[model samples]
Target chain A: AIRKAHIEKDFIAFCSSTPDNVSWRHPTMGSVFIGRLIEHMQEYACSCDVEEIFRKVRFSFEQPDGRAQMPTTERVTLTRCFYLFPGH
Target chain B: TSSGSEGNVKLCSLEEAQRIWKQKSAEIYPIMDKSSRTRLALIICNEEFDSIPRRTGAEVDITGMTMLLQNLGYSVDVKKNLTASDMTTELEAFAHRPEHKTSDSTFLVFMSHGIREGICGKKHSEQVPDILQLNAIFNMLNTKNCPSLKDKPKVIIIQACRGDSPGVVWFKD
Candidate 1:
């Protein structure tokens, strides 16, 4: 399963997709999932400068400021993974 | 006379080579950090004689490097098996592209057989001036044209041999 969120307060967006069943999975699925999330976020944000923020959120499973941390295992949950776009 | 001749000959030292290699590696290791938003582009070209085995090592290296950069929090774009003309066109287009022109950092790597002043692709040789040409393209992105990348670092890495001669040889015992 995969999920995404946009945070607009400080121009931040996040996306995460984790494995529902770790037993049967593609060897490169993790990387592929991350790639898709970045592609989608880029389309949504449309800002190359701030896209790295989403990338960090997806891979590191942390907030933009590094103060709030999310469990890597919970990335699959759509609600846990998404954030609002900064302005909205 | 025998003593003087012996003095003139230097013995091969693997230890010295290893020392230099380690030093160089340490120098480049710190630059691998990727906490910042840096846009990186990697370009690789490989050409082999038809008689030789077809190996895609160049592609593998570029892909691996790009992934590594991505993992470290950098956005990377990878290009493989580009000919000289293709390189020129691609770079020209990238320079002209509105989005790319605004990138904070641009990294370009070239991997191919090279002579004193240029790199050889599958069918043509790209002059060293290709760097200047690409930079000139970027120069078009002035504050007037592209304000995003006004004063950013444009790094170019060339992994081609700069001379026709074989690599330096250490003295053998």
Candidate 2:
């Protein structure tokens, strides 16, 4: 479907974990993927593009225990940057 | 508010964004007017299953996602605990929403227990494993199916356990 759409540069998928691993769920906080993503967006969405924001989300998982779970971005067909232009 | 600021910075206003937009029009996706065009997002979260243990922290994901998308100017529509077929129906409906006609981009999020192929439905199990293929999303919202969204950005976020393998022997999904 992605190939047919020819949106290789316009479509991107963000996964919480690798295809072979399970995503961790914090009993009180939430899924590790989501919590970290929200944290990054709160800080970066105002200024960065989607790819940059996801890059930061991926980086946040590089901590100690973070190695147990890894987030991934896939099917990237984006040709240009995508910005939310928040509050605008 | 200035965009791309460091700690404790603010978001850009419409006027400021326009100035930047003019400067970078050829470099970025065209943003629709926020005041006149409607931006939309769809969230499907399956926290409970008929055969597996419930997804305990999924609610937090939903909350955080809702707030974030809303702050980004999207009117979010959320669905919870849907079956495989129900998921298909919802995706089809969302893809064809009239609002997309005037929208510049959309965000589609799905949170559930999953396998390599896709997210599991409420009735999912080893025997009956109700799976909503991840590919279905791209199929439903692609230019052929959703012409209104053609040439527009469609961001997909999936939060689910892809497999049973814990990255290590000590972690849990």
Candidate 3:
């Protein structure tokens, strides 16, 4: 609740990689949680239902298995919503 | 399980890693020209310990991670409480996993107590397996070695403490 109930108060603990050779920032071990996310999201699309992005990430705690970030439905919508953005 | 590690390695931290990432990568996420492929992420989280106090945030982090990864289009596998030997065996095996061949990008995240060289593992009496010496793990992923992952994005996220890193030396550093 702490992460979700308010701002992303949790420290960063995040980092990533690429295609067409797009290399985002490198993330090492044990950093602030939010800081990590900011760096990792570099290469991905900004149009993603990035709306409640922060809240969404906070609520993500409820399903932390890292199991399914993009469910089948979410994928379809994203593909459609963002097809017009850059790379379809 | 018990650790089977022994070595001298550089201490690491997320902030430090981030700096390196920034310096090395030319850009962040890049728009593609229509490439749809399976994405994968592996989460190795260790919360239980003997000598080191248990961590309460591991689970929370893992769960939060699931969503982040999924939204990013990755299918994840969660492995818990790995000892040193386990880390070696597990990571090596994963590095060579058939999935790498199909994935556009992959992520391997570890959450555990750590000293400069590498991660620590679950406890076994006075000895918790060494878990690993950092070099041994990444070497397996080299494009020179893992052809399947060559040129593909391999994202490695580690959340662990290093020798006197961050908060250890100062107040809530």
Candidate 4:
């Protein structure tokens, strides 16, 4: 069985199987989640031009088409992505 | 008073004397103790850019005129730096005031920046229609509204730049 977990705080992350059997699952969910996480992190994090930087980037979700996709138990983790200074 | 015209017996040509006499007779009969029978209210709005040092010429001239009228014994009410809302409130108050309603005569002077037939407040251009809205407040003080200043003289002096350019010019010799 594929297990799913949701991390909640100022930033939220979702952990799920990379190749799950679920139909029409969001392939780009990781990217969307990471973008939102970056936004929230910047909101609390002190940085000049942070808002401006975030506003310039585009965000979207990726979805997988049904059929021809194999199911695997590999876990996928999504975290905040920053173009500038990942630790900061 | 009736005996002088009938006996024009001698015809003497005193043309220069006649001219001098006529000029002497054209003197103005000044009213000695004429009390102020008029009340005046003046409102001026000067929305000059913040950096400018002096008030606009219109504000200075109108405010000076108001002071002159007050010195002449006329009851004068003056307000400067008014916004549109301020004007509306003042007009409403004037219209509703019992003393203003019953005064023998009243004058209003408005001085401000303007376009053709429109005055500008701090916010936007105000046309005559917006001004006429205050007429309701004045009409409320009519004999039908207040009954005191019935049929009295109400003079309005609007010193606003009207038309694309200034109108009316005269040349002197």
Candidate 5:
């Protein structure tokens, strides 16, 4: 759909998990993907671009036990870097 | 001994940000209309379904996302527990918001129980599944559909299960 829109160069999609997987959640601690996302943004949103922030989020899922769910970026056609540039 | 002013560090000022944009315009998207402050975002989370099991912990995702976007200077509009049709309506309306003309970018987030087809609506069932095709989002927000947002970034975020598998194997990331 994003391809057909012809706005691919300006659009990006972030998914919690791939098309063949189930995204996990802790009963009390909330979802691993979103929780890590919030944490990464808190530390980096003011300094990094969107792609870098997403890469950090994906890195947080790297576990020794293979117990974590991997997040993904789909249909990314960004022509230039995007920054939140918060408070500026 | 350390000072307790770790959180008080200064960030980029408006003039500094403008200078960076001017120098890096070829490599970065232009952040126009900084003074207008027209950034907008839409969030939809379907936690409870009529027949499907409730999506526990979704509230946490919505709360975190809303706060984060607001921190980044977006005025977020949140809608919860909508049917598929209602979801479409909200997306269309958001795409047409007058604010987009002066805005540099926007964010759209949807959270729900899902399948490969798309996110399940509140009234979904095995026999009568109410699914909102993710493609519809792009279609509605496309340049043709929302010309005001042309050449601007549209950041989409989705949190949902694509299937029942644990997906443990290493694959192309």
Candidate 6:
């Protein structure tokens, strides 16, 4: 869990950076949107092991001199039993 | 039938098409509480290939998919580089999981380069000719066959292109 005034700048910065990835989609498929998952996955999964793929990412929307603190939205993915790029 | 040669020589059809085409009320839908239902998601992605070009960035795709499903309240699992037999085997195992008994929705996802016939797989072993048809998936999960999933929503998301032809575009005002 991230603190309200923790200023989750590290994770935020991580999520904003783009890795070597294509934004391609099926030409005829519906525009099913994915959030900032790609950038975080790049930061963690590419640099980490298969077991490390599934982990929590936390975010808070509170500013300094906070009045009413809001809840944090923590997200997670799944583990990889088999490897996509097996060589790695 | 009022006739002055059929209702005083009507200029064009007197009755509008509305009365001819309107349908009656259909069956009422059952109330379902999706949020309270257990959600399960499965992801199968293949990036490595023996003959065709290896799919790059597919790992990123799988991660994104997993995260999205997890965020949407699914207990997610991922399998990789599955051949025809492996795919069928995986789904059969998946279908048998106890989760289906409790889950209201199931999300089965696949990402690969494919043909109209089926999804592609590694061709290292020519004797196997790896591929799996869409029909197998449907038949395995249909209400009649898979009672655990009966009356439940089973959403299958496929990330494969069947052809090289350009898709059509539509616009609305």
Clashes of each: 13, 7, 26, 2, 0, 0
The lDDT of model 4 is 0.36
Q: What is each candidate's DockQ, to 2 decimals?
A: 0.01, 0.55, 0.04, 0.00, 0.48, 0.02
Give the higher-DockQ candidate: 2 or 4: 2
Q: Tell me the tens digit of each residue's lDDT in model 5 across B1-173.
A: 11221122224457766775776678987787667759899999998899988878888888888877777778899999999999999998998899999899999988888887889889988899899987888888888888888888899988888888887766575
lDDT per residue as tens, model 3, A8-61:
111112221110111111133322442344333422233332322333443433
lDDT of 6 by residue, B1-173 (tens): 32232221112221321221222122111223444556577888777877777776676677667765664456788999877778888888888888777775566777776654556765523355577776677666665456676655455555554444322333473
lDDT, candidates in the order shown: 0.37, 0.83, 0.48, 0.36, 0.81, 0.48
The regions of model 3 sitting more than 4 angstroms off are A1-31, A34-88, B1-36, B124-129, B165-173
**Docking class of predicted structure 2:** medium
Query: How do the residues B40-113 of candidate 4 rate in per-residue lDDT, one tens digit apiece?
Result: 44444443422222233444455444543343334667766565566767766665665553344444555554
Worst lDDT window (10 residues) for model 3 chain A? Answer: A71-80
TM-score of chain A of 6: 0.24
2 against 6, candidate with superior TM-score: 2
- Among these predicted structures, which one has the highest lDDT? 2
Best prediction by TM-score: 2
> What would the TM-scores of all predictions be?
0.40, 0.87, 0.54, 0.40, 0.86, 0.51
Chain A TM-score for each candidate, in the given order?
0.25, 0.83, 0.25, 0.22, 0.82, 0.24
Q: State in Å the error of residue B15, model 2.
A: 9.3
Q: What is the interface RMSD of each candidate, in Å?
A: 25.1, 3.1, 19.1, 42.8, 3.3, 25.5
DockQ for model 1 equals 0.01
Candidate 4 vs 5: which has more lDDT: 5
Off by over 4 Å in 5: A1-8, A64-67, B1-25, B170-173
Which consecutive 10 residues in model 3 chain B have the weakest lDDT in total? B1-10
Instruction: Judge candidate 3 at residue A18 and give its lDDT.
Output: 11
Model 5 lDDT per residue over A1-88, tens place: 3455464458899998878788887657777777888778767766678889999998887762445478899878788889777666
Cα shift from native, residue B114, model 6 (Å) = 0.6
lDDT (tens digit, per residue) of candidate 1 on B1-173: 21431221222245643443454453211121223334445455454522222333445445544653443233565555555566666665555555444344444555554444455555543332332232333333333443444344333444443443322234455
What is the lDDT for B138 in model 3? 57
Model 5 residue B85 CA deviation (Å) reads 1.3
Question: What TM-score does candidate 3 reach?
Answer: 0.54
